[PDB]
């Protein structure tokens, strides 16, 4: 086989031309996130904008992930710089989502019920809502094909 | 291949390596700083209590005189005395101006003998001066 | 390579030091070498020599 | 401005945008295996850019006031 | 205590601004007129170090973040020494310490209102500068006057009060938040070269320098 | 080591610092390259110490000396250093006091 | 929801009292893996935590073998369950875990030249299992008390977990006071080893 | 070689999921002849502002020139995660060591706190706890008066207070999880 | 404080109160004879030389807001040999006239 | 007097005397990099380093080689006759940067040109001296000829 890797350091700014990740066809391990474009045949992730790449993990299953590119670099830069400075001054809180050991709890105390909202299957009558709602304009969108929760 | 056993004193020395390493990590777990007052001696609270009970009973150590310096009261006892001493202190090789509004006609060494000229030092074994003053100007 | 200097060449070099503080300067009977200097430093040498009155 | 840039882009020859040398104007060597590097907008200059640590950046300015690329 | 601008303000000269911060408190902006007409070389050094017009020589040549290492109340306020920020070193933009070109006059007299250049030995002038806090008659015939302080003298004097000891070692830290050129010639094409997405210098975040750290 | 040498007779003791010979009239010796190099080393120790101390002093001036002993690697290696948890009891919930 | 994204694990109330590292005791809400949750729930030993099931539940005593033990979960039950879990969590963390250990060995037969003791067994526990216990609860084997552990390969040691009869811990563990702490000592050269 | 440990700092050995192995990763670290200037997007360039401050000095009357200053470019709080020593029941005047560190060059500590203490009389939210749920009546009182307090502060106050209270929610939850036996460290492991 | 009151009045001089308390509220409340320590600065052993020399003869007051860190700092103190430690909160030493 | 010491209180840090007891070629290159950062080359060398956190991060990794001793700064002020009213910051501000092996420069070529520039500044010092003299002499001759003609 071939080794298919990251071509950039995650958490480091990246130009559009540079590849982000080369995947292997198995749903892919890494899915396109904000400002990211995936080559449909190659499953190689490219950057749309010029910014800082970060990895999201799906709250449902931690092994399925997204690559995001955050457009303004200096925000991330001076945020991280101050954060680090505080870390050295013992003045920083370890409760932020940046801390990977804490993000489970963080998702827990905000929305405790996200388990039962994911496990909850709608029936067909509320999946497929009667279109006259959409016709009359009670609801402005009719989209039967989102039955699945990706978070 | 390794055939005959390790002798006993070798592994004794290895045990000594172990608790040398441990002796290090105890040092590493000591705090970064220590809060002291101005008037008390520098060694008042100290981590060495059990160390003094175990190794320090009657024997004179190599650090003796220094420890004698530690176990007497501090010679600068108040911040006012501190800054009253410290403002008097002058810096000779410092860069930039030095206040002289008091008496003008007391000339320093530099504005008398210049920046390129050091006094001839008697040069021998126990008196060794800095050589080549032109090197140090980086 | 600076050739046509005629005179005290070392004064030329001692001002050339001020022009090129970082680079390496060497003296020879006929010429003066400045190292790691491209057409930039050539442009400069010429601006300086023109400004100097030659 | 952008109309000027569009016209300046479409006016230039196809041989103005090709690779002209072993080294991109940054000084990096372009090995031919990567298609991102098959284009060169500004011509590379090997004999310039030795004086930039000793000089003010105002020298780097081009004819239109945009800093030109030098080899570093 | 009233501050009168010592000289008559010529318009050929550049005006350079410096933002001073004491222990997190941003005091204000000190604007400096540089004497270009009488003092062309040292002016250009002080202007280049206040801009970032030039890159890394032995250090970033930029006055941003660099503390005031020596402050004597009623005498001087001193800062500079980009390389080795304690005050132990002198770096020019030239690549070597330049001698004072001339004392002449208007550059010879240290008045209350004046920014001057500090040297460790007579003919080596570095990056280190000092503000005169009073009329100094014993420094005339030694150190070069670079220029005046036009606005924000309150800032400087406040630095002298809150940050200093007659020993010269500062009680509290006073460092430069920002510095730049607000006027004078060569201004437009200066800020063109500093314009772009890519900056010239890599420095700590904006509010790291402002509140807790003096770029050590 | 106790008596103020290094481990060997030929370093750091009285056996170095003292001149091997005078003259008869008391005129002392001269400075060897090695003597001067040794003086440089001997001052290199002092410069080292003073710079280290200076760094500590501007670190606790700037307030970067933590109130928590050891680094993070030492903390998750060693069950000696206490947990520095603030408002909770270290071991589960608070113990009974009767 | 999706066939692709499957819940890494789903919350479960227990009816039975189950032995293994995944299974809990009766009445507590624990989130366990999909494949175990389904095999517990389809066998009727576990229910989906609806609210009225969070208030009270029909569990069973093994004597009668029918679900007639009614437990209502009040405050004094929930602190009880908290303590019980954080006991057997330490229980199922330590024996399930196998603590890798490596050191230096010189001489002929397979001995460590720096034998183990109770202060560094307890150290490895914290280093890789994040288990904090008082080191004086550990006891060695009879053969290893006199010399320390000291031999290469597979060794086991014993950890005393003191308080549980308050929590009614019986038959859901292998024994109420002990965990077999499993050590493996590997010899490595001066590059990779310590001491 | 093809080892997992290639081209990594020893701190980063733990991340197996992103190996630095390969030929071009050897070229972009020792920065060799395609990569001689590596990351072409590196810190200290921003495409969004181009390093110029967006501040409106263009104000019609020259008196109020500095009126809009400290208008936040982003949340400033949610990103950093400074640890606030403030319970939610404190007065607002304690909120500005924290506002000051982003707003310096605009106002001083004492100035910010006097403006805040203005907000306590002028608007009925004295408590930091009150400043969150009243986030609205704060903001419209702000817009209606328009210049009793600089409109830059009123969006600092809101999103600072929100985060102070949020952080207290986190501490109150994390504490109560210890007695329920979750037991995580200072680093939250 | 039908006991504590005469204990802290005139029974001795004092600097007797270590407050381990947030910097935010010690500006709000303040008790201006107490040494403001940090609870981490106590447990660590970095405060030992300013803490009194004779371990047995001393009795120290821990002034804490949250009682959990009162209980933490008690142990912190008895780790260094201070057994007699009395936990006091702010309102308690209000009636004692200590503020 | 069974009471807390009256404060002003000063905070005094520590200093690590580090001694290398083992051959670095026995150990991996990471441990060697750490020993390099501690300024230790061989077996038997001793170094003095600060107590700041980074240093402990280094000493922790090499602790099976290095043996350590600690001196708080009062004790360091005692170890050398130093008046107590004198801090170490001023003492550091006095000593010259020109001390041997001054900087950590990234490759030997840079080191070489660092020393080279050290010599260059010497040459330029003497040349600028002489040139300044020529300048002033030129001005004296100018003023002399101007005052003489007029």
Q: Check if the beta carbon of residue E48 is closer than 8 Å to that of residue E61.
A: yes
CA angle at G5 for the pair G2 and G10, rounded to the nearest 5°:
95
| Antiparallel, parallel or unpaired: β I60-63 and I85-88 | parallel
Quote the CA–CA distance of B108 and B9 in Å, as a whole number: 66
CA distance linking residue D61 with residue D45, whole number of Å: 15
Contacts with A11 (C-beta within 8 Å, 6 or more apart), sequence order:
A52, A53, A54
Burial of F89 (0-12, 13-18, 19+ CB in 10 A): middle
Q: Which residues contact F33 (CB under 8 A, 6 or more apart)?
A: none
Residue J49: enclosing H or E segment and its boundaries? Answer: strand J46-50
Handedness of CA H124, H130, H133, H138 (dihedral sign): positive
Q: Determine, for residues F73 and J73 on separate chains, whether the beta-carbon distance falls below 8 Å.
A: no
Neighbouring C-beta atoms of residue B71, cutoff 10 Å: 11
A60 touches chain G (CB under 8 A): yes
Tokens 């003998």 correspond to B113
- Burial degree of E139 (CB within 10 A; 0-12, 13-18, 19+): buried
Contact B100, E138 (CB under 8 A): yes
| A31: number of Cβ within 10 Å | 18
Residues 152-191 of E with CB under 8 A from H: 177
Angle between the N-to-C axes of helices H154-176 and H109-122, in degrees from 0 to 180, rounded to the nearest 10: 90
Give dist(CA G24, CA G92) in Å, integer.
11
The answer to whether I24 contacts H175, with C-beta atoms less than 8 Å apart, is no
Distance CA J89, CA F61 (A): 11
The residue whose two tokens read 């970033």 is E60
I14, I15, I47, I63: best mutation site toward chain J, by most J Cβ within 10 Å?
A: I15
Pair E37, E12: CB distance under 8 Å: yes
CA distances from D37 to D22, F13, H35, J150 (A): 11, 67, 11, 72
Nearest CA in chain G to J66: G195
> Closest approach of chain F CAs to the CA of I76, in angstroms?
10
Say how many residues make up chain D: 72
CB of I49 within 8 Å of any CB in chain B?
Answer: yes
Beta strands in B52-123 (DSSP E): none
Q: Are G121 and G148 in contact (CB under 8 A)?
A: no
Using a 10 angstrom Cβ sphere, with 0-12 exposed, 13-18 middle and 19 or more buried, the burial of residue F91 is middle
**Measured distance CA(H185)–CA(H188) in Å, rounded:** 5
State the DSSP H helix or E strand holding residue F52, giving kind and residue range, or none if neither. Answer: helix F33-62
Q: Using H for helix, E for strand and C for coil, what is the string for chain H?
A: CCCCCCCCCCCHHHCCCCCCCCCHHHHCCCCCCCCCCCCCCCCCECCCCCCCCCCCCCCCCCCCCCCCCCCCCCCCCCCCCECCCCCCCCEHHHHCCCCHHHHCCCCCHHHHHHHHHHHHHHCCCCECCHHHHCHHHHHHHHHHHCCCCCCCCHHHHHHHHHHHHHHHHHHHHHHHCCCCCCCCCCCCC
**DSSP for A107-125, written as a single string:** HHHH-TTHHHHHS----HH
Strand, coil or helix: A91: coil
**Contact present, D and J (at least 3 Cβ pairs less than 8 Å):** no
Question: Under 8 Å CB-to-CB from F36, ≥6 apart: which residues?
Answer: B128, B131
Distances, alpha carbon G64 to alpha carbons G45, G59, G68, G69, G70, in Å: 16, 11, 8, 9, 13
According to DSSP, the residues that pair with E72 across neighbouring strands are E76
Axis crossing angle, helix C9-19 with helix J108-149, rounded to the nearest 10: 120
C1 touches chain E (CB under 8 A): no
Q: What angle do CA H128, H131, H133 make, to 5 degrees?
A: 125
Please state whether at least 3 CB pairs lie below 8 Å between chains B and H. Answer: no
Assigned token pair, C38:
């491209």
The count of other CB atoms within 10 Å of the CB of residue H132 is: 18
A137: left (phi over 0), alpha (psi -120 to 50) or beta: left
Enumerate residues 6+ apart whose C-beta is below 8 A from G27: G13, G14, G57, G59, G71, G73, G77, G81
Secondary structure element (H or E) that encloses residue E114, with its range? strand E114-117
Nearest Cα residue to H116 out of H104, H99, H102:
H99
Experimental method: cryo-EM
Q: How far apart are CA E152 and CA G59, in angstroms?
A: 80
Which residue of B94, B96, B116 to mutate against E (max E Cβ within 10 Å)? Answer: B96
The rounded radius of gyration (Å) of the Cα atoms in chain I is 13
Nearest to B75 by CA among B44, B35, B39, B46: B39
Enter the DSSP assignment of D58: G
- Residues A110/A112/A115/A116 CA torsion (nearest 10 deg): -130
Contact C21 D54 (CB under 8 A): yes
State the CB neighbour count (10 A cutoff) for residue A50: 23
The CA distance from B126 to the nearest CA of chain F, in Å, is: 7
Q: Do E55 and D61 touch (CB under 8 A)?
A: no
Taking alpha carbons only, the member of B73, H101, J16 closest to residue F52 is J16
Among residues E30, E29, E20, the alpha carbon closest in space to that of E65 is found at: E20
N residues, chain H: 189
Q: Which residue has the tokens 């750490």?
A: J34
User: Tokens 């170890």 appear where?
Assistant: J79
For an interface test with F, which of A84, A86, A88 has the most F Cβ atoms less than 10 Å from its Cβ?
A88
Asked whether the beta carbons of I78 and I43 are under 8 A apart, the reply is no
Rounded Cα distance between H122 and H120, Å, is 6
Inter-chain touch B136–J96, beta carbons under 8 Å: yes
Which positions in chain J touch E97 (Cβ < 8 Å)?
121, 125
**Residue B129 structure tokens:** 């001066």
DSSP secondary structure, G153-179, as one string: EEEEEEEE----SSS---SSSS-SSEE
Q: How far apart are CA J27 and CA B31, in angstroms?
A: 29
Structure tokens at F46: 């002092």
Binning chain F into helix, strand and coil, the percentages to the nearest 5 are 40, 0, 60
DSSP H helices, chain D, are 2-11
Q: Are A62 and G8 in contact (CB under 8 A)?
A: yes
Report the candidate in E13, E175, E154 with the shortest Cα–Cα distance to residue E80: E175
Q: Is C22 on the interface with E (CB under 8 A)?
A: yes
User: What is the rounded CA–CA span in Å between residue F20 and residue G181?
Assistant: 66
Helix (H, G, I), strand (E, B) or coil at E102: coil
Three-state DSSP class for residue E72: strand
Please measure the distance between the N-terminal and C-terminal CA atoms of chain B and give it in whole angstroms.
58
> CB neighbours of B59 closer than 8 A, spacing ≥ 6?
none
Query: Which residue, among D45, D53, D54, would best test binding to C if mutated, counting the most C CBs under 10 Å from its CB?
Result: D54
Contact F47/J99 with Cβ under 8 angstroms? yes
Q: Are G132 and G103 in contact (CB under 8 A)?
A: no
**Could you tell me the end-to-end alpha-carbon distance of chain E, in angstroms, rounded to an integer?**
34
Report the C-alpha gap between G26 and G14 in whole angstroms.
5
Q: How far apart are the first and last CA of chain C?
A: 18
Helix (H) or strand (E) segment spanning residue B84: helix B79-86
H neighbours by CB contacts (3+ pairs under 8 Å): A, D, E, F, G, I
- Largest separation between any pair of C-alpha atoms in chain F: 87
Residues of G in contact with B17 (CB under 8 A): 114, 195
Q: Which residues of J touch B38 (CB under 8 A)?
A: 7-8, 10
Q: State whether residue E210 is helix, strand or coil.
A: helix
Q: C-alpha angle C26/C32/C37, rounded to 5°?
A: 80
Distances (CA, A) of E92 to B93, E46, E180, E214, J93: 20, 9, 17, 21, 20
Collapse the DSSP code of G29 into the 3-class scheme (helix H, G, I; strand E, B; otherwise coil) and give the result: strand
Q: How many CA atoms lie within 13 A of A4 on its CB side?
A: 15
Residues E193, D53: C-beta atoms closer than 8 Å = no
The single-letter DSSP state of residue G80 is H
């Amino acid at each position: 086989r071939k080794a298919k890797l990251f071509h950039v350091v995650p958490g480091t700014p990246v130009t559009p031309f540079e590849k982000l990740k080369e995947q292997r066809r198995r749903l892919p391990e890494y899915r396109p996130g904000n400002n990211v474009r995936m080559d449909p045949n190659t499953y190689t992730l490219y950057a749309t904008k010029k910014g800082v790449m970060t990895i999201r993990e799906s709250r449902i299953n931690p092994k399925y992930k997204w690559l995001d590119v955050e457009p303004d670099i200096q925000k991330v830069y001076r945020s991280r710089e101050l954060r680090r400075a505080l870390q050295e001054r013992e003045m920083a809180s370890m409760a932020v989502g940046e801390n990977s050991n804490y993000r489970v709890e963080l998702d827990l105390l905000l929305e405790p019920d996200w388990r039962e909202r994911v496990m909850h299957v709608p029936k067909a009558t509320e999946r497929f809502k009667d279109p006259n709602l959409f016709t009359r304009g009670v609801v402005n969108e009719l989209s039967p094909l989102d039955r699945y929760s990706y978070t | 291949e390794l055939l005959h056993p390790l002798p006993v004193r070798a592994r004794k020395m290895e045990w000594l390596k172990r608790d040398a390493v441990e002796e290090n990590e105890e040092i590493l777990r000591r705090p970064y700083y220590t809060i002291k007052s101005y008037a008390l001696p520098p060694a008042v609270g100290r981590q060495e209590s059990i160390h003094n009970s175990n190794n320090i009973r009657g024997g004179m150590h190599s650090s003796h005189s220094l420890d004698l310096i530690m176990r007497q009261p501090r010679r600068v006892k108040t911040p006012e005395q501190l800054r009253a001493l410290r403002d008097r202190l002058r810096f000779i090789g410092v860069t930039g101006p030095m206040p002289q509004a008091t008496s003008v006609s007391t000339k320093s060494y530099t504005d008398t003998y210049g920046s390129r000229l050091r006094p001839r030092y008697p040069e021998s074994w126990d008196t060794v001066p800095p050589h080549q003053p032109s090197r140090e100007l980086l | 390579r600076i050739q046509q200097v005629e005179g005290d060449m070392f004064r030329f070099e001692e001002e050339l030091l001020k022009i090129f503080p970082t680079k390496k300067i060497f003296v020879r009977s006929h010429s003066i070498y400045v190292y790691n200097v491209a057409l930039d430093g050539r442009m400069v040498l010429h601006h300086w020599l023109l400004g100097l009155g030659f | 401005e952008e109309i000027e840039a569009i016209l300046a882009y479409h006016a230039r020859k196809p041989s103005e945008l090709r690779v002209r040398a072993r080294h991109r104007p940054d000084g990096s060597t372009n090995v031919g295996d990567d298609p991102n590097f098959w284009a060169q907008a500004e011509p590379t200059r090997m004999m310039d850019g030795s004086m930039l640590s000793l000089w003010s950046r105002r020298t780097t300015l081009g004819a239109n006031g945009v800093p030109i690329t030098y080899r570093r | 205590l009233q501050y009168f601008v010592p000289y008559e303000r010529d318009e050929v000269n550049p005006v350079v601004f410096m933002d001073v911060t004491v222990e997190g408190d941003a005091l204000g902006r000190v604007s400096v007129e540089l004497f270009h007409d009488i003092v062309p070389k040292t002016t250009e050094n002080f202007r280049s170090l206040c801009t970032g017009e030039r890159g890394y020589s032995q250090c970033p040549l930029f006055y941003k973040g660099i503390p005031f290492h020596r402050v004597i109340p009623g005498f001087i306020v001193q800062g500079g020494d980009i390389l080795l920020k304690d005050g132990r070193g002198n770096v020019s933009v030239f690549g070597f310490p330049f001698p004072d070109e001339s004392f002449e006059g208007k550059a010879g007299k240290h008045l209350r209102g004046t920014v001057a250049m500090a040297h460790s030995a007579p003919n080596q002038n570095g990056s280190q500068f000092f503000f005169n806090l009073a009329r100094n008659d014993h420094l005339d015939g030694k150190f070069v006057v670079c220029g005046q302080v036009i606005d924000g003298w309150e800032v400087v004097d406040r630095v002298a009060v809150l940050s200093g000891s007659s020993c010269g070692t500062p009680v509290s830290r006073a460092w430069i938040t920002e510095c730049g050129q607000s006027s004078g010639d060569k201004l437009e094409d200066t800020e063109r070269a500093l314009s772009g997405e890519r900056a010239l210098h890599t420095m700590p975040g904006k509010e790291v320098l402002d509140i807790l750290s003096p770029r050590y | 080591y106790y008596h103020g040498h290094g481990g060997c007779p030929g370093k750091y003791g009285p056996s170095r610092e003292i001149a091997d010979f005078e003259y008869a009239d008391g005129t002392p010796a001269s400075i060897s390259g090695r003597r001067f190099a040794f003086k440089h080393h001997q001052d290199h120790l002092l410069v080292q110490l003073i710079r280290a101390a200076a760094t500590v002093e501007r670190y606790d001036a700037s307030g970067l000396l933590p109130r928590i002993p050891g680094t993070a690697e030492q903390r998750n290696w060693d069950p000696a250093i206490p947990l520095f948890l603030d408002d909770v009891d270290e071991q589960g919930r608070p113990a009974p006091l009767r | 929801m999706a066939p692709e994204l499957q819940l890494e694990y789903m919350p479960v109330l227990f009816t039975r009292t189950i032995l293994g590292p995944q299974g809990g005791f009766a009445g507590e809400e624990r989130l366990v893996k999909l494949e175990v949750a389904r095999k517990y729930m389809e066998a009727g030993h576990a229910v989906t935590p609806t609210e009225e099931l969070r208030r009270g539940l029909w569990c069973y005593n093994p004597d009668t073998d029918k679900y007639d033990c009614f437990i209502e979960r009040n405050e004094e039950f929930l602190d009880f369950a908290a303590r019980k879990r954080q006991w057997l969590d330490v229980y199922w963390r330590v024996n399930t875990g196998y603590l890798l250990f490596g050191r230096q060995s010189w001489g002929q037969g397979f001995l460590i030249n720096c034998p183990l003791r109770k202060r560094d067994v307890a150290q490895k526990l914290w280093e890789q299992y994040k288990v904090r216990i008082d080191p004086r609860l550990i006891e060695f084997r009879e053969k290893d008390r006199r010399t320390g552990i000291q031999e290469l390969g597979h060794n086991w040691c014993w950890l005393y977990l003191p308080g549980a009869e308050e929590l009614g811990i019986n038959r859901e563990v292998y024994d109420n006071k002990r965990v077999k702490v499993r050590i493996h000592v590997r010899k490595m050269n001066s590059m990779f080893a310590l001491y | 070689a093809r080892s997992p440990l290639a081209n990594k700092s020893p701190d980063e050995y733990g991340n197996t999921w992103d190996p630095r192995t390969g030929v071009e990763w050897y070229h972009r670290l020792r920065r060799r002849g395609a990569y001689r200037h590596w990351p072409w997007a590196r810190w200290n360039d921003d495409p969004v502002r181009q390093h110029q401050e967006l501040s409106c000095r263009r104000t019609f009357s020259a008196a109020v020139t500095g009126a809009n200053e400290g208008v936040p470019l982003w949340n400033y709080y949610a990103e950093v995660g400074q640890e606030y020593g403030l319970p939610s029941h404190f007065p607002l005047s304690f909120m500005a060591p924290f506002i000051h560190q982003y707003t310096s060059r605009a106002w001083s500590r004492k100035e910010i706190e006097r403006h805040l203490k203005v907000v306590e009389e002028r608007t009925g939210l004295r408590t930091i706890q009150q400043a969150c749920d009243a986030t609205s009546e704060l903001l419209e009182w702000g817009e209606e008066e328009m210049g009793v307090v600089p409109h830059g502060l009123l969006q600092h106050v809101v999103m600072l207070a929100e985060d102070i209270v949020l952080q207290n929610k986190k501490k109150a939850y994390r504490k109560a999880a210890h007695e329920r036996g979750i037991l995580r460290t200072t680093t939250m492991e | 404080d039908s006991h504590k009151l005469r204990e802290k009045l005139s029974s001795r001089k004092g600097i007797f109160v270590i407050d381990v308390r947030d910097p935010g509220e010690r500006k709000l409340n303040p008790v201006p004879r107490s040494v403001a320590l940090h609870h981490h600065d106590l447990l660590s052993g970095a405060s030992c030389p300013i803490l009194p020399q004779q371990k047995s003869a001393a009795e120290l007051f821990v002034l804490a807001s949250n009682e959990s860190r009162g209980l933490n700092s008690a142990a912190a103190l008895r780790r260094w040999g201070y057994d007699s430690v009395v936990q006091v909160d702010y309102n308690t030493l209000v009636e004692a006239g200590y503020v | 007097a069974a009471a807390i010491a009256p404060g002003p209180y000063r905070r005094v840090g520590n200093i690590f005397i580090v001694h290398c007891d083992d051959h670095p070629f026995k150990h991996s290159w990471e441990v060697n990099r750490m020993l390099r950062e501690l300024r230790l080359e061989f077996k038997g060398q001793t170094t003095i380093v600060p107590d700041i956190p980074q240093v402990r991060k280094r000493i922790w990794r090499v602790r099976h080689i290095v043996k350590v001793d600690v001196l708080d700064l009062d004790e360091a002020k005692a170890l050398i006759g130093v008046p107590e009213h004198i801090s170490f910051t001023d003492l550091a501000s006095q000593l010259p940067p020109s001390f041997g092996r001054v900087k950590a420069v990234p490759s030997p070529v840079i080191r070489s040109k660092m020393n080279f520039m050290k010599l260059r500044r010497m040459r330029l010092r003497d040349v600028l001296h002489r040139d300044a003299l020529e300048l002033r002499l030129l001005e004296l001759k100018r003023s002399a000829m101007k005052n003489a003609e007029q």
